Amino acid sequence: LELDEQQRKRLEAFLTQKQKVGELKDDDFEKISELGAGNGGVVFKVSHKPSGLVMARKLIHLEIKPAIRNQIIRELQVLHECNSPYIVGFYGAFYSDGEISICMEHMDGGSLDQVLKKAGRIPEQILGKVSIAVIKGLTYLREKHKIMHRDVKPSNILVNSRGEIKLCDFGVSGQLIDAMANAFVGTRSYMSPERLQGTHYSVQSDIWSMGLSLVEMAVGRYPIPPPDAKELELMPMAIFELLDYIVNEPPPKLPSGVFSLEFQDFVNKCLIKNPAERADLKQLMVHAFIKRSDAEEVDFAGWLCSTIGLNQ
Amino acid sequence: SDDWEIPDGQITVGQRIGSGSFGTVYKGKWHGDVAVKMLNVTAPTPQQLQAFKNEVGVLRKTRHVNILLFMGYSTKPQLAIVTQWCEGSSLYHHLHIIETKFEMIKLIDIARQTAQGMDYLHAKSIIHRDLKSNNIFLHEDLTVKIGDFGLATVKSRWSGSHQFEQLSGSILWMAPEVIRMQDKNPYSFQSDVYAFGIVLYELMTGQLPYSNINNRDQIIFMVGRGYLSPDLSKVRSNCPKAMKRLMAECLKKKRDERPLFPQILASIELLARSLP
Numbered sequence: 001l002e003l004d005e006q007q008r009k010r011l012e013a014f015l016t017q018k019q020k021v022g023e024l025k026d027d028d029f030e031k032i033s034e035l036g037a038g039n040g041g042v043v044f045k046v047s048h049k050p051s052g053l054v055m056a057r058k059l060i061h062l063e064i065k066p067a068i069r070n071q072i073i074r075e076l077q078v079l080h081e082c083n084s085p086y087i088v089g090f091y092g093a094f095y096s097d098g099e100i101s102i103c104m105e106h107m108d109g110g111s112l113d114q115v116l117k118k119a120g121r122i123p124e125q126i127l128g129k130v131s132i133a134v135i136k137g138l139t140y141l142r143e144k145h146k147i148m149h150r151d152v153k154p155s156n157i158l159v160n161s162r163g164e165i166k167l168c169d170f171g172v173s174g175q176l177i178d179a180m181a182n183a184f185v186g187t188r189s190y191m192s193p194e195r196l197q198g199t200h201y202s203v204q205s206d207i208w209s210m211g212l213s214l215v216e217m218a219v220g221r222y223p224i225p226p227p228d229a230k231e232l233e234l235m236p237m238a239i240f241e242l243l244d245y246i247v248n249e250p251p252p253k254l255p256s257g258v259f260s261l262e263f264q265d266f267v268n269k270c271l272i273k274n275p276a277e278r279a280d281l282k283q284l285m286v287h288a289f290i291k292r293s294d295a296e297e298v299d300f301a302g303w304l305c306s307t308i309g310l311n312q
Numbered sequence: 313s314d315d316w317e318i319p320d321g322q323i324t325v326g327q328r329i330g331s332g333s334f335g336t337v338y339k340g341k342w343h344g345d346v347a348v349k350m351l352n353v354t355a356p357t358p359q360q361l362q363a364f365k366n367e368v369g370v371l372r373k374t375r376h377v378n379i380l381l382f383m384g385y386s387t388k389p390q391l392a393i394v395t396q397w398c399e400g401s402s403l404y405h406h407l408h409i410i411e412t413k414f415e416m417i418k419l420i421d422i423a424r425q426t427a428q429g430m431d432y433l434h435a436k437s438i439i440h441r442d443l444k445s446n447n448i449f450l451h452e453d454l455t456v457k458i459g460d461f462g463l464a465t466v467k468s469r470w471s472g473s474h475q476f477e478q479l480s481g482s483i484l485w486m487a488p489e490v491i492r493m494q495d496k497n498p499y500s501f502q503s504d505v506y507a508f509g510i511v512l513y514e515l516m517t518g519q520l521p522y523s524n525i526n527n528r529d530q531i532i533f534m535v536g537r538g539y540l541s542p543d544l545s546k547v548r549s550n551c552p553k554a555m556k557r558l559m560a561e562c563l564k565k566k567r568d569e570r571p572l573f574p575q576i577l578a579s580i581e582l583l584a585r586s587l588p
């Protein structure tokens with residue numbers, strides 16, 4: 001991989017810690033605290049006593065046949081090969097006590113969903129760095145593994161006090177995705193309009209999801225349906241209606257005047273409903289917004305710790 | 313305390329079994345084995361609590377051989393529903409986890425008993441609201457017991473007297489108009505019939521619907537819009553033609569086109585007799 005000297009240093013340190021971790025067993029973990037819960041899972045900060053490591057442990061309770069469960073556990077093992085500065089590190093996936101455990105690196109900044117609540121709105125110059133990290137994460141996953149994320153959203157972009165921005169919860173296991181489709185529901189959606197209608201345009205839907213996520217973090221509010229009038233100058237829809245809106249209504253857009261023209265063009269190109277006219281990953285990486293963001297010096301770690309209340 | 317309310321510290325709460333769309337189930341002891349479902353609604357307003365008690369007064373009178381016995385409720389330490397503990401597995405576990413090989417005479421009989429219990433619920437004017445094979449138990453490998461019916465008041469958290477209803481748990485059994493959540497009353501006898509149609513699908517195919525689609529939001533949108541419906545050609549070859557027809561009638565997109573359970577029960581019973 002490309003990697004500056006610092007990124008290759010942290011990547012190496014992670015592989016070193018990972019060698020201390022043999023087989024993961026439920027008895028070897030100690031609960032520290034809860035990190036959050038989704039609509040189909042729960043994540044705990046834990047200590048792995050044999051290794052001394054702190055990890056985030058996601059537990060998923062699926063009532064599925066053992067052959068499907070075993071395939072899910074097999075497919076997740078590919079996460080051992082997913083090593084990139086823009087991908088949440090991975091320690092192991094196993095089954096025990098009716099629960100699928102996925103043990104990953106602990107990100108002390110939380111998700112950008114949490115960060116967004118604490119920030120109100122995330123500044124454009126911070127969003128530039130986030131976009132670079134997401135584009136690069138999605139590129140890594142597609143080029144090195146043929147993986148399509150399929151779940152880009154603020155709660156699946158994790159950050160930490162070192163300033164790293166990393167993707168997680170991507171579709172390494174199509175069996176896991178399918179089992180979860182059968183068992184749970186969300187309350188909102190970042191799915192692209194063409195996939196809602198059953199059309200598959202590779203990573204173009206992840207790009208749509210990103211654009212949607214960037215609008216939500218820019219304005220401080222999930223953007224389907226668009227803000228109504230005076231709501232915007234301060235600067236609940238059911239799941240089916242949200243999906244119908246995505247499919248049948250024009251895509252969201254940033255407010256004018258508040259954001260740079262490059263940033264507005266960048267999200268507009270992401271949110272084109274036509275998945276072929278939508279920008280792809282190569283085109284976004286050279287977009288003016290990204291070229292500008294990549295050259296700005298932004299103390300992302302400083303801004304995050306400040307936003308969260310942590311120390312430097 | 314109140315009628316059919318179990319006071320604090322009478323139920324010995326044992327092992328946690330799992331959680332579903334609106335609660336978390338524990339195995340418990342209270343004059344025998346019970347399932348205790350701790351409701352997600354932990355903080356209920358006086359209006360919500362009152363409407364819940366009124367609903368419990370209805371549910372506790374729904375006694376029938378194919379209905380899981382409603383045993384009581386608790387408010388302390390937390391809101392909870394106490395029901396008969398089922399030995400063995402739900403129909404969902406039998407079909408999709410154990411892969412129990414039933415013969416066709418016994419698949420029909422499971423559908424018969426379910427229609428029997430659903431017929432009773434509707435005769436008592438109760439919308440189930442949540443029929444699915446996880447809520448059908450084959451008790452002691454013999455009798456079908458339908459569970460988790462009614463309880464509309466606790467399937468949504470309340471902001472005063474108004475409650476916002478959101479989809480929760482699996483969507484596979486929801487009728488198009490339940491998915492849409494747009495009508496005044498999305499839930500109806502006919503939306504139960506649709507869910508039963510899906511149960512029939514599981515019995516006659518051995519599979520959940522939409523097995524070829526792993527994108528949940530595509531399913532929600534397309535089922536809701538009427539663009540997508542169960543693939544009836546997955547039905548196994550030994551399924552009687554009349555059962556396939558009945559299934560298709562239960563699954564009609566327009567609720568007014570769906571039969572009711574007296575007619576459904578009469579069809580299955582006829583089919584059971586005119587069967588090898």
Ligand SMILES: Nc1ncnc2c1ncn2[C@@H]1O[C@H](COP(=O)(O)OP(=O)(O)NP(=O)(O)O)[C@@H](O)[C@H]1O
Nearest residue numbers: 035036037038039041043056104105106107111155
């Ligand atoms: N590696 C991690 N380190 C720290 N916090 C984490 C980590 N992974 C997940 N979390 C937190 O755990 C929360 C729950 O995650 P998750 O179960 O994937 O649901 P979700 O992404 O928040 N929402 P949803 O996917 O719609 O069900 C996330 O929002 C994060 O706040």
Ligand SMILES: Nc1ncnc2c1ncn2[C@@H]1O[C@H](COP(=O)(O)OP(=O)(O)NP(=O)(O)O)[C@@H](O)[C@H]1O
Nearest residue numbers: 329330331332333334335337347396397398446460
């Ligand atoms: N009366 C019961 N006896 C034994 N096991 C039960 C009983 N009720 C529920 N369970 C089990 O407890 C777990 C949780 O059930 P539950 O919370 O009802 O979710 P669900 O049935 O899968 N979906 P839903 O009922 O719509 O919320 C499942 O493994 C059930 O099989």
Ligand SMILES: O=C(NOC[C@H](O)CO)c1ccc(F)c(F)c1Nc1ccc(I)cc1F
Nearest residue numbers: 038039040041088102169170171172173176
């Ligand atoms: O976790 C996933 N989705 O979110 C789950 C929430 O609990 C839903 O509420 C998920 C879905 C498909 C898949 F293949 C995975 F590998 C998943 N998990 C997953 C993937 C990479 C890392 I590094 C860490 C992880 F955990």
Ligand SMILES: [Cl-]
Nearest residue numbers: 325326338350
């Ligand atoms: Cl408890």
Ligand SMILES: [Mg+2]
Nearest residue numbers: 038155156169
């Ligand atoms: Mg997540």
Ligand SMILES: [Mg+2]
Nearest residue numbers: 332446447460
């Ligand atoms: Mg249930």
